[PDB]
């Protein structure tokens, strides 16, 4: 067959506003363009404010991942202010933020992704849908998917109770500020956090990780597509001591089959195909500028195009798990053997092709959720009830700082420059920015644009795999554009 061009706007069961347009020839995607169609401009809204306000304002980029922005912002402010966060505050922050990794991954798999594979009950918002939706599960396994979707609504809510115990509320925590965390954990509230955590652990171990491998085993073809550049970024997250040198996820870049170090000075944001003034193209974030140009010819997105030493990279659970290569979960090892005939001990034992795939990204996210359980358990042993979690630093007249972390969807940094005790510049380079960006000034596609190449579309009237691929990356276009 020849060409069909398919536009999907809105792409649903993601966060935020995304259009995807693909060119299909002879049953496969041969080109793609992703458009982030909504802009707010946090980087300009922030200018002129008390810098401390940033750790509230920036959360409103994203109600799914506000703890990530909170974290990046307070780390940036800590550095700019010379705030020395007490050890117990570092741990408390990790408990606040770690709980939202659990929430976000569970939300993503069940409430956003699972309907790609599972038919929900016969009422909105589960119908109508494509007449040929390629829903392959047995009646029993489909029902398990629905039952777990419903249970997961309660589990993700409990994860937000965990966040709120020391974070104040969620979405949009009050409990992280420059200098640490605003509420010392009490013995009683640590009991409450642990009790909720146990319920979440049981759900992750018994339902979520097994269902991803089990559904994956019915969609083995989905490990064979969606590779894209096979290139990944991790900037580090969840500091494990006060040195700034040791993190749960360590930084690294992977591209063209090679591991390389991460040097943030090699990040540049291009705008040829983005709705920003041409003169702002190619800037590192320390010199970043955000000048909207919604009528600029040729542009197709409000997402800038970040490149790392010229490379187009992806971010997220796959990126972190590939870069760090942890041991696989016990249940993952078992199900890989039983359901796939794969012998594996560490994440990379999946191999590059299967890891960097549509279904591999879902597997990576489930594995990472399991991995986070151990981290949280460790923090619950390490935390000291009653020990102070904050310092109260004076606002500097002139300073700069950068905070680096990993949001649930991938690498996140915030840069702040303070002048006359106010925000002079604030630049954000976020996770879905790395994934869902348009072409750069040389015409090289963004990570998801490239991962769309080769996606099968055997039925143009039911082109379900286009958005299935996109959903594997857990896009958050609020974050991508800000």
């Amino acid at each position: 067959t020849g060409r069909t061009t398919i536009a999907i706007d809105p792409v649903t069961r993601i966060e935020g506003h995304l259009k995807a347009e693909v060119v299909v020839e002879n049953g496969k995607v041969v080109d793609a363009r992703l458009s982030g169609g909504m802009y707010r401009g946090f980087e300009t809204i922030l200018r002129g404010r008390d810098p401390r306000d940033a750790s509230q304002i920036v959360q409103r980029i994203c109600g799914v991942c506000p703890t990530a922005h909170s974290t990046a912002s307070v780390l940036a402010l800590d550095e700019a202010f010379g705030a020395k966060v007490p050890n117990n505050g570092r741990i408390t922050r990790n408990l606040i933020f770690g709980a939202n990794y659990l929430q976000s991954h569970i939300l993503h798999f069940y409430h956003l992704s699972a309907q790609d594979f599972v038919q929900g009950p016969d009422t909105a918002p589960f119908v109508p849908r494509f007449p040929k939706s390629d829903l392959r599960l047995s009646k029993e396994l489909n029902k398990a998917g629905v039952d777990q979707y419903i249970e997961a609504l309660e589990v993700r809510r409990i994860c937000h109770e965990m966040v709120a115990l020391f974070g104040g509320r969620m979405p949009h925590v009050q409990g992280q500020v420059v200098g640490g965390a605003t509420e010392i954990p009490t013995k009683e509230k640590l009991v409450e956090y642990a009790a909720r955590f146990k319920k979440v652990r049981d759900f992750v171990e018994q339902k979520y990780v097994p269902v991803v491998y089990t559904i994956g085993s019915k969609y083995k073809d989905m490990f064979k597509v969606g590779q894209g550049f096979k290139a990944a970024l991790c900037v580090g997250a969840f500091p494990l001591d006060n040195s700034g040198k040791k993190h749960l996820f360590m930084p690294g870049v992977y591209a063209k089959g090679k591991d390389m170090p991460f040097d943030p000075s090699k990040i540049k944001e291009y705008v040829k195909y983005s709705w920003f003034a041409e003169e702002t193209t190619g800037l590192n974030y320390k010199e970043g500028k955000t000048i909207p140009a919604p009528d600029k010819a040729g542009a197709y997105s409000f997402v800038k195009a970040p490149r790392y030493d010229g490379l187009s990279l992806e971010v997220g659970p796959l990126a972190r798990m590939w870069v760090n290569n942890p041991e696989l979960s016990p249940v993952g090892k078992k199900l890989l053997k039983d359901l796939f005939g794969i012998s594996a001990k560490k994440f990379r034992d999946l191999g590059e092709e299967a890891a960097f795939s549509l279904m591999g990204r879902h597997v990576a996210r489930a594995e990472e959720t399991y991995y986070m359980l151990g981290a949280i358990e460790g923090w619950l042993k390490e935390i000291k009830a009653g020990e102070d979690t904050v310092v109260m630093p004076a606002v500097p007249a002139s300073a700069e700082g950068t905070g680096f972390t990993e949001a649930p969807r991938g690498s996140l940094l915030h840069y702040v420059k303070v002048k006359d005790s106010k925000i002079d510049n604030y630049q954000i380079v976020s996770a879905s920015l790395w994934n869902c960006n348009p072409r750069d000034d040389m015409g090289q596609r963004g990570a998801v644009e490239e991962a769309l190449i080769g996606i099968p579309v055997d039925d143009i009237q039911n082109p379900v795999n286009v958005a299935r691929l996109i959903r594997a990356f857990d896009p958050c276009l609020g974050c991508a554009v800000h």
Partner: protein, 283 residues
């Protein structure tokens, strides 16, 4: 409710939102969000959670809208940006035509039973409309008025709102409509809105005047560090004195905390949020 009861159609449009107003709703304890979706409303369009996609999803909404002309509820999350001919928020494409948030609100707004402006962005403009913005971010009521659209609006603000304020306002309205029909019912709802369009059951009481640290405020005993939970939080920036919400009582996230206990109130339900409540960390 029951799986087979009457459940009115709802379309949920996101403008310049962060999805936090959707997420806060997912946190409803009672009724649970599962029960809301399966037993209370029929959520026919919602880009974050619905099965279908793209032009097909838009056309589904349009078919339901035609069937239920004058009768569907329209939830707006986020502000509506008017600059650049609406281009700062495109929400879909159908018939090879892009649909801006401006377009969508002009299309569906006139035909809704009522518009629920959920969150401070939708209600009042919020952060997207704050100083330093350049998109012409506009509140729902102002946008509709400017365009001659007379459909009733109810504001359910907060950044985010508590789920109980969202679900509770829906319950208030559906009860009024059950008792009085649509126009009589909406008139009963409007009677219990304050001057900022907020339901006085949830927004009729001031935080500070009901705060457990009020004695400390009156004594002048002020915490100098966030982690001192004995003193009043006023010197640390608490905006409770200027804020109308019931957070002091229902608290947040299953009652496990609230902003004043944990840190400070930032006045997130108020029409001047954020700029009139900033700086957040001093009085």
């Amino acid at each position: 409710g029951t799986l087979t009861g009457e459940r009115p159609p709802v379309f949920w449009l996101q403008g310049q939102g962060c999805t936090g107003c959707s997420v806060t709703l997912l946190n409803s304890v009672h009724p649970s969000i599962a029960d809301v979706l399966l037993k209370v409303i029929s959520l026919e369009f919602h880009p974050t959670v619905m099965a279908w996609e793209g032009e097909h999803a838009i056309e589904h909404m349009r078919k339901v809208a035609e069937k239920f002309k004058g009768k569907f509820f329209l939830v707006i999350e986020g502000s509506v940006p008017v600059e650049a001919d609406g281009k700062y928020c495109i929400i879909g494409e159908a018939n090879h035509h892009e649909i801006s948030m401006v377009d969508a609100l002009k299309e569906f707004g006139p035909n809704a039973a009522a518009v629920l402006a959920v969150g401070t962005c939708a209600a009042y403009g919020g952060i997207p409309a704050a100083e330093g913005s350049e998109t012409g971010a506009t509140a729902v009521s102002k946008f509709l008025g400017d365009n001659g659209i007379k459909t009733p609006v109810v504001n359910i603000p907060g950044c985010p709102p508590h789920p109980d304020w969202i679900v509770g306002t829906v319950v208030l309205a559906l009860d009024a409509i059950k008792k009085n029909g649509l126009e009589g019912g909406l008139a009963e709802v409007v009677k219990v809105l304050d001057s900022d369009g907020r339901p006085t059951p949830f927004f009729g009481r001031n935080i500070h005047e009901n705060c457990p640290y009020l004695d400390k405020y009156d004594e002048g005993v002020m915490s100098a560090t966030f982690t001192d939970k004995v003193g009043c939080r006023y010197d640390l920036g608490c905006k409770g004195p200027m804020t109308m919400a019931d957070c002091f009582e229902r608290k947040w996230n299953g009652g496990v905390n609230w902003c004043v206990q944990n840190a400070v109130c930032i006045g997130c339900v108020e029409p001047d949020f954020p700029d009139g409540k900033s700086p957040f960390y001093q009085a």
